[PDB]
């Protein structure tokens, strides 16, 4: 089978999401980290080990050395990227990827030599019978219905603006913007000291990334929300913690999603999120631009906010013409919306002649990924 006997690996922009197909929720998610203790000796608290990867490495960080395989959303090193693939297949799931076809993701703008590198890894070391290379952009759009429209990739890494027309994406419109959710959490840190609250460990700095998606909310019309904050409305919240540090928010409730449209709070001259949305559609074909406005889809970890659908609607109408019917399609889950699209593509009625198998890899090498 492949409805349940196929694996959906969604290698995100900082988190790996593995799990069998057919479900609407991934099995095991954790941040993609590896850890190397450079020498041996005694190991206390955990087992004597030459390499802590995954969940045993997240409990020991000032004990270990840290390494991110996914920086700026693109794989920078291929040794530790396979080490997490070794960790997800055999330790957190414990199934052999030698009989089950494996569905893995990629970046929309990665080179073909990187795309040939990941085909060489899955066939030789894991011995998969078949696989398929799919962009993360087409999976989130397929979970939103038909395969036409533009998706707003804003994860932990680099924002992608990929317009897709009926399953085929545009070559010269994949715009790369350096706005990231890690920049906004660092932006929240440099205005928390103005309140007077600081840090002493890295563990207190970790929960700011949780508070960025939990406590901070999107207000429709950020511009009066700071005007009502100028007249001292009730918008200051103070979250309580078990230890003595009390992290509060003031006007930083609405400002970390306001930094998406206003990058001057981040300290740069770059385009806003609605601007790189508008700049991508402004170089498409003029007849398919109407099909892109009515199928705007939000996805990622930075976009995890309540009330963000109508805020993106009112922001795009000032640049787009007023005769276009624009609809922001906001799913309830969007970090995992790429994973549910990879599972419904796995449960397609016909996927058997699209398999990249071991036989064609032996006959044409890793250039069969060109398809």
């Amino acid at each position: 089978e492949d409805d349940i006997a196929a694996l959906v690996v969604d290698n995100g922009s900082g988190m790996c999401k593995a799990g069998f197909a057919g479900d609407d929720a991934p099995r095991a998610v954790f941040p993609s980290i590896v850890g190397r203790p450079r020498h041996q000796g005694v190991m206390v608290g955990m087992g004597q080990k030459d390499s802590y990867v995954g969940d045993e490495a997240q409990s020991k960080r000032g004990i270990l050395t840290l390494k991110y395989p996914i920086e700026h959303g693109i794989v920078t090193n291929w040794d530790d990227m396979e080490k997490i693939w070794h960790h997800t297949f055999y330790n957190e799931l414990r199934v052999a990827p030698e009989e089950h076809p494996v569905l893995l993701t990629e970046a929309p703008l990665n080179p073909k030599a990187n795309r040939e590198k990941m085909t060489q890894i899955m066939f030789e070391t894991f011995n998969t019978p078949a696989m398929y290379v799919a962009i993360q952009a087409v999976l989130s759009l397929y979970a939103s219905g038909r395969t036409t429209g533009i998706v707003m990739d804003s994860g932990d890494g680099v924002t992608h603006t990929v317009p897709i027309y009926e399953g085929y994406a545009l070559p010269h419109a994949i715009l790369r913007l350096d706005l990231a959710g890690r920049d906004l959490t660092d932006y929240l840190m440099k205005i928390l000291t103005e309140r007077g609250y600081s840090f002493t460990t890295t563990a207190e700095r970790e929960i700011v990334r949780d508070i960025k998606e939990k406590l901070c909310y999107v207000a429709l019309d950020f511009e009066q929300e700071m005007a009502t904050a100028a007249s001292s409305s009730s918008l200051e919240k103070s979250y309580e913690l078990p230890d003595g540090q009390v992290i509060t928010i003031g006007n930083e409730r609405f400002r970390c999603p306001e930094a998406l449209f206003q990058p001057s709070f981040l300290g740069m001259e770059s385009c806003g999120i609605h601007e790189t949305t508008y700049n991508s559609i402004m170089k498409c074909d003029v007849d398919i631009r109407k099909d892109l406005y009515a199928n705007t889809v939000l996805s990622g970890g930075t976009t995890m906010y309540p009330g963000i659908a109508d805020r993106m609607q009112k922001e795009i109408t000032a640049l787009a013409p007023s005769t276009m019917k624009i609809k922001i399609i906001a799913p309830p889950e969007r970090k995992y919306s790429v994973w549910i699209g990879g599972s419904i593509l796995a449960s397609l009625s016909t996927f058997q002649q699209m398999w990249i198998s071991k036989q064609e890899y032996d006959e044409s090498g890793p250039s069969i990924v060109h398809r």
Binding site: D24, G145, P331, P332, I344
Partner: peptide
Amino acid sequence: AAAAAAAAAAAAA
């Protein structure tokens, strides 16, 4: 038929 109407609401979400 009752699960098919709920599957359309699950596919739209």
